[PDB]
Amino acid sequence: GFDLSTATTLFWRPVPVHVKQQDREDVLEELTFRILTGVAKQNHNLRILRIHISSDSDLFFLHTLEVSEEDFQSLKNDQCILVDFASFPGKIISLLEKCILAQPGDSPRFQAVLTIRGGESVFKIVEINDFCQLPHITLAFRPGN
Amino acid sequence: GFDLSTATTLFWRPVPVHVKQQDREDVLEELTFRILTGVAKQNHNLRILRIHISSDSDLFFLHTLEVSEEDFQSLKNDQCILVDFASFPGKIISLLEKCILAQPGDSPRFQAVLTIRGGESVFKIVEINDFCQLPHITLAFRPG
What is the experimental method?
A: X-ray
A6 burial via Cβ count (<10 Å: 0-12, 13-18, 19+): exposed
Out of A83, A131, A136, closest to residue B134 by CB: A136
Would you tell me which residues 39-98 of chain B have a C-beta closer than 8 angstroms to some C-beta of chain A? 79-83, 91, 94-95
Q: Please state the domain count of chain B.
A: 1
Query: For residue A48, what is the enclosing H or E element?
Result: strand A47-54
Query: Chain B residues with CB inside 8 Å of A81's CB?
Result: 131-132
Out of B91, B131, B133, closest to residue A131 by CB: B91
Can you list the pairs that A30-37 forms with residues at least 24 positions away whose Cβ atoms lie under 8 Å? A30/A56, A31/A55, A31/A112, A31/A114, A32/A56, A33/A96, A34/A9, A35/A9, A35/A10, A35/A11, A35/A89, A35/A92, A35/A93, A36/A2, A36/A4, A36/A7, A36/A8, A36/A9, A36/A10, A37/A7, A37/A8, A37/A10, A37/A89
Residue of A nearest to B95 (CA): A131
Resolution of the coordinates in A? 2.5
Query: With contact defined as beta carbons under 8 Å apart, do B138 and B122 qualify?
Result: yes
Range of the domain at B72: 1-144
Q: What are phi and psi of A73, to 5 degrees?
A: -60, -45
Query: With contact defined as beta carbons under 8 Å apart, do B40 and B3 qualify?
Result: yes
Out of B81, B128, B129, closest to residue A131 by CB: B81
Query: Chain A residues with CB inside 8 Å of B82's CB?
Result: 128, 130-133
Is the Cβ of B139 closer than 8 Å to some Cβ of chain A?
no
Query: With contact defined as beta carbons under 8 Å apart, do B130 and A137 qualify?
Result: no
